[model samples]
Target chain A: ERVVINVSGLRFETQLKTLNQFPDTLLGNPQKRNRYYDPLRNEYFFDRNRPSFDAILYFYQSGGRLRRPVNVPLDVFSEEIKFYELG
Target chain B: ERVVINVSGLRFETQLKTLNQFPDTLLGNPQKRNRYYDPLRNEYFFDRNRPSFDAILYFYQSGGRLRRPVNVPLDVFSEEIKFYELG
Candidate 1:
């Protein structure tokens, strides 16, 4: 299922079947993330940091690697990484 | 650190640190995938199927599993998995 994800005002288009591969994280929660979808907005709303979110997504798309953005604060990046369990 | 991946026309942002874990696949090739960057577009271009790519990325982000897309042709998915070496 194709999905448009809205993360911190930024929009991303992806497939649910793709995101479903990882069930331990927020995206995997059927009752939380999957159960909710914005048909009117046409996207899933996620209140997250866009910069770190980019790196988190890369962990999925690229091989399992989370290259921290130099511009982002270390604490912020680590928090996202820990929450997402990317590494 | 942060990368914007363009799988076909879909744009997905991710972290390089996260992807560095799986060095065997396309994202792991430092000289091939990592050496190349698109500052102009601020994204990486990969000519691949968006559907399977989602499942593929999920393998890295999730607990290393490919749940498989229901609508996608098994052969096509196998072909993509074969290329990426994704389990």
Candidate 2:
């Protein structure tokens, strides 16, 4: 028996929008925080401090019983990806 | 303060077709890789190396304040997963 594994986490950067602002910070820096405000959308004009990237980790068991635990690396990507067990 | 956590991951199998084959591979080879192809989708006629399973880990604190490290297991799952600390 072999058990599989899965892990996901993210690292943060500072150059992101703190809030879901309009014109997105990526476009241009709004002179004033409230210069471009949309009440209905509840979005501001510009505010740096947003997310940049994300990554995921998945593992699989090879030749073993259906219940054994398999030791795998923390991060690795392969083309031989396929779902075998469902829960 | 208590902290919140959320984690998701998946395991893969080796019996799936090269591309998104049909019939899935779960039928004919209920003995093979356990996948049946879906012709409408241009999947293989037979053969299936199906996925095996998935797992998630989440963590959250009970009380206290914010900005504290909440030590949790390597296999816990949590909700309230937010973008506050978005990466």
Candidate 3:
């Protein structure tokens, strides 16, 4: 299965299997992430901070590595991790 | 509007607005890309080379900068651009 994530207006396309790699995270947990799903658009819509998601999703994409995007602030990015329950 | 492109098994999520930036391209052209739509999964599926798409999609994401991925060969990437009608 595949997944579509729309952070604000920026959309990210990825597969469900990738997020399944980290089941404890919000996106990894189907029930948890489903709350944000937009049935009309057939995508998950997130109003949270956008830049941080670039790195957050990359964490799942790269398996275990989590690198902060260059422009994202430490506190802002950390808060995103906490919000997504990435711990 | 959003679009989901599944290249082989690797999926990509993006918005129709971003793709509309280059309306002449396959993905940008609604009718052209619609041929590949998979209603069951609510995604566009392509059996094309996966690696090249990473760069291909980025071309739209970056607003027309087409940088070949490090591992994709020149001819293969060129063929993909042609296939997508990126020109």
Candidate 4:
């Protein structure tokens, strides 16, 4: 299941399963619906560090381990993890 | 010490210390000289997967950990590591 995500101005077309690799958070909660749906564009807007969000997604993409985005500061990334509570 | 690296055509301006984080292969080898110097741009050419090269640099930058690029396949990345012999 593919989903479109808007990271501020940056857009990413990826899989829903990828976002849900970590359960417990809004992005990962299969039970809950991810909000901020754009009726016009048919996508979701995640208002956060565009870079950090991209960074976190890799944990899901690369077999449940991190390949931290070099662009994002480690401190900021930690916060994002807290925000999503990425399990 | 910072250096300019040309990963295919994608340019990266990073610290020599960052490239040398592993120190087993060319980028990491403190003793051996790295080839592909550019007189005009003051950069080095590494003719390989620009994307994967970016991925490897993260292994250096994220403090010797990976945050694999979402775009590159896992198998291709393994090959790039071998090409560099990144310890």
Q: Flag the better candidate by TM-score, 1 or 4.
A: 1
lDDT of 2 by residue, A14-56 (tens): 2213222223222123444345444553443211101101211
Q: Model 4 chain B, poorest ten-residue lDDT window? A: B30-39
Per-residue lDDT tens digits for candidate 4, residues A53-83, read 6445555665465545566677888888877
lDDT string, candidate 2, B1-87, tens digits? 111121122212212221112232222123442233333643323221111111211111101112211232232212221211111
Full-model lDDT for every candidate: 0.65, 0.21, 0.80, 0.66
Return the number of clashes found in candidate 3.
2
Instruction: Report the candidate with higher DockQ, 1 versus 3.
Output: 3
Candidate 2 reaches a DockQ of: 0.02
**Between prediction 1 and prediction 2, which has the larger lDDT?**
1
lDDT of 1 by residue, A6-33 (tens): 7634577766766666766666556667
The DockQ figures for the candidates are: 0.02, 0.02, 0.03, 0.04
Per DockQ, the best of the predicted structures is 4
| lDDT per residue as tens, model 1, B1-87 | 555677788666556764666887777566667544677876677788876665566556543655566657899999998777654
lDDT score, candidate 2: 0.21
**Which portions of model 2 miss their true places by more than 4 Å?**
A1-53, A56-87, B1-35, B44-87
Native contact recovery (fnat) for each candidate is 0.00, 0.00, 0.00, 0.00
Candidate 1's displacement at residue B18, Å, is 2.2
The local lDDT score (0 to 100) that residue B6 gets in candidate 3 is 86
Residue A18 miss distance in model 1 (angstroms):
26
Would you estimate the TM-scores of all the predictions? 0.50, 0.15, 0.54, 0.48
